[PDB]
Amino acid sequence: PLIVPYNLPLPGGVVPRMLITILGTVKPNANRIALDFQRGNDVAFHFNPRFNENNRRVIVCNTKLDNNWGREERQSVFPFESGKPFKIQVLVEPDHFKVAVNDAHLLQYNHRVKKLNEISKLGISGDIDLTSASYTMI
Ligand SMILES: CO[C@@H]1[C@@H](n2cc(-c3ccc(Cl)c(F)c3F)nn2)[C@@H](O)[C@@H](CO)O[C@@H]1Cc1cn(C2(CF)COC2)nn1
Ligand SMILES: [Cl-]
Known part of the structure; x- marks a missing residue:
């Protein structure tokens, strides 16, 4: 286990078939x-x-981009529960990030930033106890 905030290096950025797995527990009284x-x-x-x-x-x-937030994409399906262990998996695909939580598909997010091989850090923050953050190629 690790204390947040935590920054996971992604050397040479991300690539399709890269599966990033974040394990932790949501704090009681979690806000974000x-x-x-x-x-x-x-x-x-x-x-x-x-x-x-x-x-x-x-x-x-x-x-x-350039310190300006763009268009929010919002989803009401909410798989997290205060106090519970979670697994967030971000699967990099050619045109989107695919997110599954606890082995259930949650959402896709189309690549706005095109230079995948320059997305070289993952920051993890907020109301969690972080167990691990790692990646593999599927
Ligand atoms: C409150 O700040 C938010 C931003 N944010 C969260 C954290 C954050 C830090 C620390 C911790 Cl521990 C965390 F969990 C965190 F989420 N930092 N920045 C981020 O969530 C953003 C996403 O769109 O929304 C907010 C900022 C925002 C949104 N918008 C609009 C365009 F998108 C929506 O109408 C205009 N303009 N500004
Ligand atoms: Cl934090």
């Missing part, structure tokens, strides 16, 4: 979790479970 796939200061893919946005649970996904 964030994964930030970064290309330098740009956030190619921000994955942001929010546990109480206007008393609703929502997944917010977005890209940050």
